[PDB]
Coordinates of C-alpha atoms in Angstrom, one line a residue:
Chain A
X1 CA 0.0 0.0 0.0
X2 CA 3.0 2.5 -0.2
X3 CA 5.6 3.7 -2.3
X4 CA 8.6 5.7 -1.2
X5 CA 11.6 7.3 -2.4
X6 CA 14.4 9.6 -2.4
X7 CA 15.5 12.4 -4.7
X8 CA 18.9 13.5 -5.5
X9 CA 18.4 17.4 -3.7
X10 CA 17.4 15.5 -0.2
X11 CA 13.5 16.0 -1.5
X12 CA 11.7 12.4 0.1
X13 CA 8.6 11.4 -2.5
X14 CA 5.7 9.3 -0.1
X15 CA 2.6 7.6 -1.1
X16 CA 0.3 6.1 1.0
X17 CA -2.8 4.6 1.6
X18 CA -5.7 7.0 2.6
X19 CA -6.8 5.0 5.5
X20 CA -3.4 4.7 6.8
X21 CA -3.1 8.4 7.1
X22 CA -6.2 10.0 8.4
X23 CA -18.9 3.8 -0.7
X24 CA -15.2 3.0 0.4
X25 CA -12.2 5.2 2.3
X26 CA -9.5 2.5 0.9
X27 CA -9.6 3.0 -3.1
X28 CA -7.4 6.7 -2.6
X29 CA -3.7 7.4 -2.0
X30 CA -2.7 10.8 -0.8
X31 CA 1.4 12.1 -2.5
X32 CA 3.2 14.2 -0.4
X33 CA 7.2 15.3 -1.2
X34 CA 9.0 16.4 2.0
X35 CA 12.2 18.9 1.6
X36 CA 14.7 20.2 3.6
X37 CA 15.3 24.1 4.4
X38 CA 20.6 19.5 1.5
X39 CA 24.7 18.7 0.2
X40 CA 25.4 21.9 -1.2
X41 CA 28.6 22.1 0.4
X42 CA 29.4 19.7 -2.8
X43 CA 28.8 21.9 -5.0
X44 CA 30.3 24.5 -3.9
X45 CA 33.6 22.9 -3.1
X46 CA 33.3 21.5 -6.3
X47 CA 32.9 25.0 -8.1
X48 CA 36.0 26.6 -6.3
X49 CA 38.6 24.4 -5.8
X50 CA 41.9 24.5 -7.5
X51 CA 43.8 21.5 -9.2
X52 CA 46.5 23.2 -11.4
X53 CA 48.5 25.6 -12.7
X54 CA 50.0 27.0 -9.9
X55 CA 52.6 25.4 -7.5
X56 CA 51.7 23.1 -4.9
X57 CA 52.1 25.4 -2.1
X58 CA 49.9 27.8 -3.2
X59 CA 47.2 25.5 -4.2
X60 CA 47.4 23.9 -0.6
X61 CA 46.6 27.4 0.3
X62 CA 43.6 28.4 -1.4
X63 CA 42.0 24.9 -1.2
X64 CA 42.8 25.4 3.0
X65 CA 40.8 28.6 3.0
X66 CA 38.4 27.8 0.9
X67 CA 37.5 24.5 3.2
X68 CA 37.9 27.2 6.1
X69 CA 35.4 29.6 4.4
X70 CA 32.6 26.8 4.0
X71 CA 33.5 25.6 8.1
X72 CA 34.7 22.6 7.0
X73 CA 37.6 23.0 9.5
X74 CA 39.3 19.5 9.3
X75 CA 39.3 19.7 6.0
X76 CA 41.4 22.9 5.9
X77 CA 43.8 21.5 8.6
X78 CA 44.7 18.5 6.3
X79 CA 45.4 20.5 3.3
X80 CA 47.5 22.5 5.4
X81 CA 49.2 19.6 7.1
X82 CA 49.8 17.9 3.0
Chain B
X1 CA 83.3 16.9 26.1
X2 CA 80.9 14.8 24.4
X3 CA 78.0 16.2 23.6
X4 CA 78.2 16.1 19.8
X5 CA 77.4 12.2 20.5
X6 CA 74.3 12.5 22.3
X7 CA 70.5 13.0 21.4
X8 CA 70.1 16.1 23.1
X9 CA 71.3 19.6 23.6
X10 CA 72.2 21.7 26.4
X11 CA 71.1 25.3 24.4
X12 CA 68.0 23.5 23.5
X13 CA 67.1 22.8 26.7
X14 CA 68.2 26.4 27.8
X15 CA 65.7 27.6 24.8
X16 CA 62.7 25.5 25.1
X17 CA 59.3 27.0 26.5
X18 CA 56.2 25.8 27.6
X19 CA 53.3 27.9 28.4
X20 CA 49.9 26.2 29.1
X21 CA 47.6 29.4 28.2
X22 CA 49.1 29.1 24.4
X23 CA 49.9 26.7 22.6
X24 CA 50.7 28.4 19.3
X25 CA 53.0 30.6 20.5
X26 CA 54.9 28.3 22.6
X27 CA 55.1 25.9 19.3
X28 CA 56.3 29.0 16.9
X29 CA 58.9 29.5 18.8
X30 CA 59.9 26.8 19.7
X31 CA 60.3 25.7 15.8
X32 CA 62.5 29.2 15.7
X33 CA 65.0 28.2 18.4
X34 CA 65.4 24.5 16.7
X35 CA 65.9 26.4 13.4
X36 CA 68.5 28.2 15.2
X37 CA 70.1 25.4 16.6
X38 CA 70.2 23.8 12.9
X39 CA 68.2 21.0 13.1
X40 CA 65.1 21.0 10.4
X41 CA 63.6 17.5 11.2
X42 CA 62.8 19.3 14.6
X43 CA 61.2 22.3 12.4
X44 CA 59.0 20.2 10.9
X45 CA 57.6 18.3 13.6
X46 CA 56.8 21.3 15.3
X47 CA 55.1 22.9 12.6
X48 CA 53.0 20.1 12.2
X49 CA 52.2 20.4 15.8
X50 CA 51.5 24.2 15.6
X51 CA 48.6 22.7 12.9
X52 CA 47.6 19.4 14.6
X53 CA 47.0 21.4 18.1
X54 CA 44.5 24.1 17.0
X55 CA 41.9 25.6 18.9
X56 CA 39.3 25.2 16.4
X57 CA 39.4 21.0 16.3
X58 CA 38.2 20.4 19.9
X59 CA 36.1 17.6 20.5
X60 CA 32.3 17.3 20.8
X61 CA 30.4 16.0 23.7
X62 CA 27.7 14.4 21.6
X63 CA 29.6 11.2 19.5
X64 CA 27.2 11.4 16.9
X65 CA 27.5 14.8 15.7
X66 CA 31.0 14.2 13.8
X67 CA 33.9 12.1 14.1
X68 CA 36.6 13.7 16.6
X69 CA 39.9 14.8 15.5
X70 CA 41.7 11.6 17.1
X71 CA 40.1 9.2 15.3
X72 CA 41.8 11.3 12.3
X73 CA 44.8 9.4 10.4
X74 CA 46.6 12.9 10.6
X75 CA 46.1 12.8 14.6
X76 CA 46.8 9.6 16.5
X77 CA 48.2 7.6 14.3
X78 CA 50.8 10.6 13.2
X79 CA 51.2 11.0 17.0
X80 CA 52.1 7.4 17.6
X81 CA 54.5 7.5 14.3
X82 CA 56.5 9.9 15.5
X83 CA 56.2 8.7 18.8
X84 CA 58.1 5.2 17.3
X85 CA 60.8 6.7 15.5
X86 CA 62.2 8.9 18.6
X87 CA 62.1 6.0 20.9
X88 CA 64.0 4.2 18.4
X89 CA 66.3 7.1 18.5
X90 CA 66.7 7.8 22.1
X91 CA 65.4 11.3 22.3
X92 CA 64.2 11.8 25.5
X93 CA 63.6 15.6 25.2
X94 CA 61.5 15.6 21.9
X95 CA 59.6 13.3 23.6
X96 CA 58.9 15.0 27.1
X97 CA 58.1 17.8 24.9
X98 CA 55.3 16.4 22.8
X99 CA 54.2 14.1 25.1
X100 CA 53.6 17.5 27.3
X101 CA 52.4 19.8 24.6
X102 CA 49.5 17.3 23.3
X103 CA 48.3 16.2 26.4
X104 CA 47.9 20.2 27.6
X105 CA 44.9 20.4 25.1
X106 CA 43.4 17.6 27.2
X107 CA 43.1 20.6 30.3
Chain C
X1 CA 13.1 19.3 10.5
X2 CA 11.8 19.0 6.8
X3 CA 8.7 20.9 5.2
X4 CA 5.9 18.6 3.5
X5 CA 3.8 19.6 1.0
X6 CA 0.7 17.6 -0.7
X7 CA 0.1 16.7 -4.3
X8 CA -3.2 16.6 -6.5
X9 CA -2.4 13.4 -8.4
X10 CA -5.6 12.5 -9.3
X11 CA -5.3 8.9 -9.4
X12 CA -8.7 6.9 -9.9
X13 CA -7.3 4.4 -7.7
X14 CA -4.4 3.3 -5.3
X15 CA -0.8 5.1 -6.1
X16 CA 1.5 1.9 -6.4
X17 CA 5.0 3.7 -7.4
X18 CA 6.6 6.9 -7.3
X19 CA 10.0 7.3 -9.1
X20 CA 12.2 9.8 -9.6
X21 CA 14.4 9.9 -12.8
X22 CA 18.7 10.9 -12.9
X23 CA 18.5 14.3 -12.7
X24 CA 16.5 14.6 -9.8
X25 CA 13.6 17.1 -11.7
X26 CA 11.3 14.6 -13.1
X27 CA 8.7 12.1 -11.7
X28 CA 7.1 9.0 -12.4
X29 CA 4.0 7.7 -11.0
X30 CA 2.1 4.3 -11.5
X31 CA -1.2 3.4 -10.4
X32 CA -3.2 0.5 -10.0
X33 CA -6.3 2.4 -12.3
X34 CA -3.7 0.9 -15.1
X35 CA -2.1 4.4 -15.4
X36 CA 1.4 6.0 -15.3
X37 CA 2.0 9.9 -14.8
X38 CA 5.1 12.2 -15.5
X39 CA 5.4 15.1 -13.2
X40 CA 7.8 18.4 -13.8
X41 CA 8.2 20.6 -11.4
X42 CA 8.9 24.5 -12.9
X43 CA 10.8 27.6 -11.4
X44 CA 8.4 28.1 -8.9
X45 CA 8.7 25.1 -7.3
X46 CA 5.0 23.6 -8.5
X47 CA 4.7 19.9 -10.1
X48 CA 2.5 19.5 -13.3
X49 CA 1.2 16.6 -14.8
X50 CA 2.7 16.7 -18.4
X51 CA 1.7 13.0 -19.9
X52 CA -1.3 10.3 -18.7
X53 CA -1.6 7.8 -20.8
X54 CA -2.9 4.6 -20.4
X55 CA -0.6 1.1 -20.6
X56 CA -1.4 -2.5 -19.6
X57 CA -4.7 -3.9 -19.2
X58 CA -4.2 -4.7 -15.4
X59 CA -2.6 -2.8 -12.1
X60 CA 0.9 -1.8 -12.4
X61 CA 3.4 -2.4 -10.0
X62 CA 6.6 -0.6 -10.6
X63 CA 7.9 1.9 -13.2
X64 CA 11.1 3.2 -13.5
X65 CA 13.5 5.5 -15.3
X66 CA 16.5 4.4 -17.8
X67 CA 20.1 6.3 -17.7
X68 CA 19.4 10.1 -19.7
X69 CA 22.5 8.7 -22.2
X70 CA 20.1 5.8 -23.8
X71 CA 17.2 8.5 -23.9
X72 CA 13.8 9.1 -21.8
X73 CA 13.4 5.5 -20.8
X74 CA 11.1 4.2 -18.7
X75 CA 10.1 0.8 -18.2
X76 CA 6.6 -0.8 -16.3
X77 CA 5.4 -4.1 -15.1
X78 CA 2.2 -5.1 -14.9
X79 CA -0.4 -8.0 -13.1
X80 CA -1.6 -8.6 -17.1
X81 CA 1.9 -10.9 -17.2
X82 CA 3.9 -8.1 -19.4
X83 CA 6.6 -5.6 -19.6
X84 CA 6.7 -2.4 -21.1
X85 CA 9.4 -0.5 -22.3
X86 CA 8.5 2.9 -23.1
X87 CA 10.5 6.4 -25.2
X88 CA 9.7 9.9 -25.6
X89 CA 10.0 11.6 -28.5
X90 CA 9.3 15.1 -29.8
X91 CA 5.1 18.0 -28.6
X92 CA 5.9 15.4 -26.1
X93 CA 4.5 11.6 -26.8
X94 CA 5.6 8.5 -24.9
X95 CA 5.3 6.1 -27.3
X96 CA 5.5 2.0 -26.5
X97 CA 8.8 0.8 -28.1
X98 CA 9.0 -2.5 -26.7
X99 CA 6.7 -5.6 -24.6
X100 CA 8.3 -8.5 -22.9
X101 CA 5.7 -11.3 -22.5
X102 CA 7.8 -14.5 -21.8
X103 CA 6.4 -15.0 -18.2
X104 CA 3.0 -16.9 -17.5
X105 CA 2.6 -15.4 -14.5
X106 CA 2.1 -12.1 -13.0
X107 CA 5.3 -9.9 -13.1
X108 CA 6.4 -8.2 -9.8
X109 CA 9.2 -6.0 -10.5
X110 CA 11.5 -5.2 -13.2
X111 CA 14.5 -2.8 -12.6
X112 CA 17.8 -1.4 -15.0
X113 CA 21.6 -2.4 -15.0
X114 CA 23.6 -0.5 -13.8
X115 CA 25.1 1.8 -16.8
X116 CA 28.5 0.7 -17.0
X117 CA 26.9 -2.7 -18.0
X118 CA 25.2 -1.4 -20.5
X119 CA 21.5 -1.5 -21.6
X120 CA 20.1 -4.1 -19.2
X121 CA 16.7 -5.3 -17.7
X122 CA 16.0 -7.8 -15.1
X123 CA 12.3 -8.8 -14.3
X124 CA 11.0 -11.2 -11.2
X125 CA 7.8 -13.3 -11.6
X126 CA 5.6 -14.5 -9.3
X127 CA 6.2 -18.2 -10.1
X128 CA 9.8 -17.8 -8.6
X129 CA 11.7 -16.9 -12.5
X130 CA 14.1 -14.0 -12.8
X131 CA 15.2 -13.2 -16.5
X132 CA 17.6 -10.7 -17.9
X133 CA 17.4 -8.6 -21.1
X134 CA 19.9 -7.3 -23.1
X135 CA 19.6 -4.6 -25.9
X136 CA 23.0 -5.2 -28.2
X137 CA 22.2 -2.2 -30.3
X138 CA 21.6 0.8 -27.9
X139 CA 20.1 2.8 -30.9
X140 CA 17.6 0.2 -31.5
X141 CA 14.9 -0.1 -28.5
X142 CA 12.8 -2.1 -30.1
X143 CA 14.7 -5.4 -30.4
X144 CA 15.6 -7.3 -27.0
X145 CA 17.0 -10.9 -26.7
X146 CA 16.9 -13.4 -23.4
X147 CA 20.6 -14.0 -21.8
X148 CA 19.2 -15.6 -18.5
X149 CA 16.9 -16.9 -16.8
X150 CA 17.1 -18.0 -13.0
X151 CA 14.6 -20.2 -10.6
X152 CA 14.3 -19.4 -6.9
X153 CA 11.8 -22.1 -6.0
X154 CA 9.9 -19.6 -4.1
X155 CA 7.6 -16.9 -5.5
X156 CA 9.8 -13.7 -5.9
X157 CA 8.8 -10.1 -4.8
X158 CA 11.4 -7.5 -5.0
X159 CA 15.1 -7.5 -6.7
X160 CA 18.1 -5.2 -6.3
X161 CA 21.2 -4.6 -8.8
X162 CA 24.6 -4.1 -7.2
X163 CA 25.2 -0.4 -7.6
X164 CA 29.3 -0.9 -7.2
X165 CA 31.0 0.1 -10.5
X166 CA 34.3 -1.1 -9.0
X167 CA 36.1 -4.1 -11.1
X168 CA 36.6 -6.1 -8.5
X169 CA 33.3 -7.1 -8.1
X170 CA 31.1 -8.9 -10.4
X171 CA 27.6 -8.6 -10.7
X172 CA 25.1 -9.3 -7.8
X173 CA 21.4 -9.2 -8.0
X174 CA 19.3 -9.9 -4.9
X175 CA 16.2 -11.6 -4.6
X176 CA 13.7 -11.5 -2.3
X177 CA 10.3 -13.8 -1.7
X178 CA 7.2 -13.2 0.4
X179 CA 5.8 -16.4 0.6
X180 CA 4.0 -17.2 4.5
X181 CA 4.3 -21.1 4.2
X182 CA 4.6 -22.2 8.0
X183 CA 7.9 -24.3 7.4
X184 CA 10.3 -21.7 8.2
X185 CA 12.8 -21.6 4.7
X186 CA 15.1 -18.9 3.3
X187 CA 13.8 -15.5 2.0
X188 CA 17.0 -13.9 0.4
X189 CA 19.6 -15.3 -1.8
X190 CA 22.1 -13.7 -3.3
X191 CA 23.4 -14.5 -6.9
X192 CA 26.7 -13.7 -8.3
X193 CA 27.7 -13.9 -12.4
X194 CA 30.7 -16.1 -12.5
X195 CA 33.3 -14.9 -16.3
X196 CA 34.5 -17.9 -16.8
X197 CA 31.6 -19.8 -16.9
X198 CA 29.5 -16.8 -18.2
X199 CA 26.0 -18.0 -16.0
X200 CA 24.7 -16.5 -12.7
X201 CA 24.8 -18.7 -10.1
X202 CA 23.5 -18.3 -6.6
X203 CA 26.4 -17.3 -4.0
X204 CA 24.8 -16.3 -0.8
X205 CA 21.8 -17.3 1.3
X206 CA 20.4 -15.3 4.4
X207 CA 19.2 -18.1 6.7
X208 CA 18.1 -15.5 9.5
X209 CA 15.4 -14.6 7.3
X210 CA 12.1 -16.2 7.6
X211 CA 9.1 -13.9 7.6
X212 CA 8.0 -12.3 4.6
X213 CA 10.1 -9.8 2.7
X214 CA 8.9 -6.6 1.0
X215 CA 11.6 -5.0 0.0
X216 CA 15.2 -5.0 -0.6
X217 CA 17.6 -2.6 -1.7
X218 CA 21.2 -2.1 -2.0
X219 CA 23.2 1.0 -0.9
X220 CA 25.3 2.8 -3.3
X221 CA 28.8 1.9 -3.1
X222 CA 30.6 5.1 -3.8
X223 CA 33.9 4.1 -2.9
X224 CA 33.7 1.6 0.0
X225 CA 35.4 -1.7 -0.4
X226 CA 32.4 -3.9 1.1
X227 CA 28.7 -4.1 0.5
X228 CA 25.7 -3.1 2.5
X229 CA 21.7 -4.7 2.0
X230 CA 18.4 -3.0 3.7
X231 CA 15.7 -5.5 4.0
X232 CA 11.9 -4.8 4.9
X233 CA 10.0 -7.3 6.8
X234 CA 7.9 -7.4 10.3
X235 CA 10.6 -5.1 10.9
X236 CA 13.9 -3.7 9.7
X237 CA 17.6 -4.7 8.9
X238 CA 21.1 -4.5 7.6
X239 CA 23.7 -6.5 6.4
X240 CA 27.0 -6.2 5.3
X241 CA 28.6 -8.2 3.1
X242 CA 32.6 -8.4 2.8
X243 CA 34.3 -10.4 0.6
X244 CA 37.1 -12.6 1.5
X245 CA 40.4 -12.7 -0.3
X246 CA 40.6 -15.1 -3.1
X247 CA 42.7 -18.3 -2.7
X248 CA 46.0 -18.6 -4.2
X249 CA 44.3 -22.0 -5.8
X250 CA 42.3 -19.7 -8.1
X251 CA 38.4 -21.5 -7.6
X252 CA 36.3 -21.0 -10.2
X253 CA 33.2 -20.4 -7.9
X254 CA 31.5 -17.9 -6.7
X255 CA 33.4 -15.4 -4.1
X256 CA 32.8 -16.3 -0.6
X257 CA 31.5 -13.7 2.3
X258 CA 31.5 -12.7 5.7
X259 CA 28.1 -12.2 6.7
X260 CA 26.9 -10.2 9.4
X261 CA 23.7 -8.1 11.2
X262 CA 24.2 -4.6 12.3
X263 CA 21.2 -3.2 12.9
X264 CA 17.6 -4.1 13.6
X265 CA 14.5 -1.5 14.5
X266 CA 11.2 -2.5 14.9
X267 CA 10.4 0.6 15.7
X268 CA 6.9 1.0 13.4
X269 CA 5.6 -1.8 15.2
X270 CA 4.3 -3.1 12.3
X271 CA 5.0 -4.3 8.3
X272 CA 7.5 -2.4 7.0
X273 CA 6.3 -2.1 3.8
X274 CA 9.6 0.1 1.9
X275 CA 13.0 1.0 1.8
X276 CA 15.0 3.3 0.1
X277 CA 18.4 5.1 0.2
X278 CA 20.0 8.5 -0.3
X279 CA 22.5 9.1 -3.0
X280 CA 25.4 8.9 -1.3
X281 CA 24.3 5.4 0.7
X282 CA 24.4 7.2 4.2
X283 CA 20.7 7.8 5.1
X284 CA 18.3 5.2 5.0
X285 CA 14.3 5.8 4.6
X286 CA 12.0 3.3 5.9
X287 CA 8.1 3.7 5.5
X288 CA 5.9 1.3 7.1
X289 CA 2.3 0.3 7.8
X290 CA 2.2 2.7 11.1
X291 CA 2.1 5.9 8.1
X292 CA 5.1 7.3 9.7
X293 CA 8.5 7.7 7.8
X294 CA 11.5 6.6 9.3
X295 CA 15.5 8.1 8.7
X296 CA 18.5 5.8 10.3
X297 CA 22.1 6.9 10.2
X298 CA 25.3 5.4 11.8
X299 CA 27.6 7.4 13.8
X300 CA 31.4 6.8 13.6
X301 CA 31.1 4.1 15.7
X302 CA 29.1 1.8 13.1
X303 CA 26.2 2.0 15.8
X304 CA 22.7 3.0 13.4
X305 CA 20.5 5.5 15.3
X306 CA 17.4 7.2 13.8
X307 CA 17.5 10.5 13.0
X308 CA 14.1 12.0 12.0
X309 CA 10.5 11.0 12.1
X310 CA 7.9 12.5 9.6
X311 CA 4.1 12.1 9.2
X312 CA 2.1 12.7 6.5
X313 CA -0.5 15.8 6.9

């Protein structure tokens, strides 16, 4: 009586049963999509990082701060510690 | 006079600091005085422990809300390396002092 | 805490499947009134219906999408003993390019290969037969030959492809059964394709399992170097499978596991009826007959704690 499943932005996709919710009450399903206020930390590390043409202390640098500026603080400590 | 046979040094020991309110500062310099005294592994390790020992990687109370610095391979595990090679050496100094300067983070 | 907000589907019966396609923007629907629905959401946020057309003669189970690099794909099963492979083409019209009709029975799933495999279909009967479809020439749709066929002796009820794109592993498919015979038998079994041999041939076997199963599913590997299974039944649980390093005698058999349980909720107090994960295999969503949705996440400590409880309205 139910069908479920995710969605690649965190959005959750739910159908169920009329009855299990609230001539006959059990020949309807009710869809509902739940989102959150989900993993765009990827993206954005993904748009701003730096993988070449400059030397490898430098790029250790501005990958560092650019962890830092998203408060991904381990993350920056490693690239500083590489 | 022997002490170009032994692992340690007299002016190190005369320059070495430890203050428990920073941590930073007392690592900064000490990495200047072992650059002074000409050795660069030293300079290294401590720069790695001016990074490893920051203020900003303290531990959570709550386990589930992410995985603490420790469990890191760049913590412990680095710890314990280095740990292994200066007993293999014989340096009791480099030892008292890391052994003091990570636990003070403990407080 | 997540924000819900209701849909006007419009269904003249029970809602059976909802599927979301590769892009994340597009949805599917499948109802029992022998209709399937595509949904597009717009700028503002808002779903419209863009497509209803009618396909089988009987309910339809499950519907789901193809990889966007073969095309708009979707494929349905259906209780009139078919499969339906279906293509858009341009205004929009979804137009049948293919029906599978080798079972006798009533189909009750059929799901895609993972890409890297290629074009690939597997569909599970109810009279306990598996068979796999292969497409050799991608730009023809229409055209589909039989590689395998598999018996479980037991009726099946949901499958799951192994999502790992790794070399190292070969390709699984899980199948699950939801017979209620009182003799207390095996539910899951786990088949592996073998190279040499080129034939699928079953390599694992879940003995804890005896009450019905609903649903199964795989999480996507993404890296790991093991592999973890989410099965739906009176109540939930996880497995993780690790493989064992191959003799230096070189057996031609199937790879050998470590099997074990790390978690088990029964926490809806009733059938869980579905499973499903997140993209990255981390969160795990379980629905069941209590109408309460269910997330579950592991700490660092591999210990698998929920995390959020939603109700619908």
């Amino acid at each position: 009586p139910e069908g479920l499943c995710y969605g690649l932005f965190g959005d959750l996709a739910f159908a169920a049963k009329e009855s299990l919710v609230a001539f006959a009450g059990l020949a309807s399903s009710a869809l509902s999509v739940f989102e959150t206020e989900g993993m765009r930390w990827f993206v954005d590390t993904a748009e701003r990082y730096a993988l070449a043409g400059r030397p490898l202390a430098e790029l250790c640098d501005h990958n560092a701060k650019v962890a830092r500026e998203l408060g991904r603080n381990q993350v920056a400590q490693t690239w500083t510690m590489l | 006079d022997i002490a170009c046979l032994l692992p340690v040094h007299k002016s190190l020991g005369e320059l070495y600091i430890l203050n428990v309110n920073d941590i930073q500062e007392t690592c900064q310099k000490n990495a200047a005085s072992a650059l002074l005294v000409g050795r660069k592994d030293l300079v290294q390790v401590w720069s790695l422990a001016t990074v490893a020992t920051d203020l900003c990687l303290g531990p959570k109370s709550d386990p589930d809300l992410e995985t603490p610095w420790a469990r890191h391979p760049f913590g412990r595990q680095l710890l314990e390396s280095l740990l292994a090679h200066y007993c293999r050496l014989r340096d009791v100094q480099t030892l008292a002092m890391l052994c003091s300067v990570f636990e003070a983070q403990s407080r | 805490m997540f924000v819900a907000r209701s849909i006007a589907a419009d269904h003249k019966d029970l809602i059976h499947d909802v599927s979301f396609d590769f892009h994340g923007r597009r949805m599917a629907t499948c109802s029992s009134d022998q209709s399937v629905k595509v949904w597009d959401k717009s700028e503002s946020g808002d779903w419209h219906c863009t497509a209803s057309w009618k396909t089988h003669s009987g309910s339809v189970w499950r519907v789901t999408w193809a990889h966007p690099e073969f095309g708009q794909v979707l494929a349905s099963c259906s209780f009139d003993r078919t499969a339906a492979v279906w293509e858009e083409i341009v205004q929009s019209h979804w137009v049948k390019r293919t029906t599978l009709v080798d079972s006798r029975t009533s189909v009750t799933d059929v799901k895609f290969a993972p890409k890297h495999m290629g074009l690939m279909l597997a569909t599970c009967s109810a009279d306990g037969i598996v068979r796999i479809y292969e497409a050799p020439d991608v730009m023809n749709l229409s055209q589909w030959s039989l590689q395998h066929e598999i018996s479980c002796k037991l009726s099946c009820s949901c499958i799951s492809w192994n999502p790992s794109s790794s070399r190292a592993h070969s390709p699984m498919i899980a199948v699950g059964s939801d017979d209620s015979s009182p003799n207390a038998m095996a539910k899951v079994q786990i088949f592996e394709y073998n190279e040499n041999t080129r034939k699928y041939a079953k390599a694992e076997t879940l003995m804890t399992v005896t009450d019905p199963v609903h649903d199964i599913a795989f999480a996507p590997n993404l890296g790991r170097s093991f592999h973890i299974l989410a099965i739906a039944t009176k109540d939930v649980r996880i497995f993780t499978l690790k493989p064992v390093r191959k003799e230096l005698t070189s057996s031609g058999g199937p790879t050998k596991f470590e099997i074990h349980i790390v978690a088990q909720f029964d926490n809806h107090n009733s059938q869980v009826w579905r499973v499903s994960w997140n993209i990255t295999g981390t969160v795990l969503a379980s629905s069941g007959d209590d109408g309460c949705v269910r997330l579950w996440k592991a700490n660092y400590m591999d210990n698998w704690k929920c995390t959020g409880i939603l109700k619908g309205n």
